[PDB]
C-alpha cells in the first residue's frame, strides 16, 4: 500500500496570506475588543469576511481539506506563518467551511470561513 | 451552467495585499479596543507585527516613495482598497520606513511598518 521509485506557487502565495490576514485580524482585535463592542466586532468579521470564531476543544471531529497539489501548496505557505501546528480543515463537527485553528496563550479556538474551496483569491 | 458569477475584480499584488492587511488589522483592533488593554494592543502589534500606530497632524511632514512603474500602481491598489485619500509615504517627520494612513471617524492616524517586515 506504499509507493515506489520509478523510472502555481505565486497564487498560493497569495491565498495563503489571505487567509493568513484574516486569521491575525480576528485573533488580535477579538484579543483586545471592548466586551462591550464584541458582538458588533463578530458581525463586523462575519457580514465583511465570512468569518466566526468558535472554540477549539480536543474533541472535535475534522475533515482534512482534499489532498491535491493546490491545497497542499496553500496549507504549506498558511503553516510557515502560523504554525506546523496549524491545523486546516474543509469541515469541523460537520460544518463545511474552510477552517483555521489559532491560539491565544494555551487556549485553542477556530475560524470558520464561508468559503467555497481553499484555493480562492478575494478582489 | 446558469447562475454563475462572472469575476470582474482585480486582485491585489502580494505586497499591496500584505499592506493592506496591516491597516486594516491595526485599524479594526483599535477601532474595538478596550481603553484598558489599549497600550497592550499597541505592544503586541510593534512586536509581532513591527507595526507603530501615531497621531497623524497637520504638522507631519512626509515623502512620498519613489516614482517608480511598480510603485505608482502598487499605491493604486493600496488606495484602491484603503481609500482615496490614504497617504503612503516612506518617511514621516524624517524617520524611515513604509509609512500609511489610515482614519477612524474624524481621526488620522498613521501606520509605520519597518520596510524589511514585508520580505
Known sequence: AHHHHHHREPRAQRVALQLVAIVKLTRTALLYSDPDLRR????DLESNEGVRVYPREKTDKFKLQPDESVNRLIEHDIRSR??????IAQSVNDIPGVWISFKIDDDDYWVALDRDQLDTVTG
Not at 40 to 43: G, I, K, R, S, V
Not at 82 to 87: K, R
Open 82 to 87: 502560523l504554525g506546523d501546528d496549524t491545523v
Open 40 to 43: 458588533a466586532l463578530l458581525q
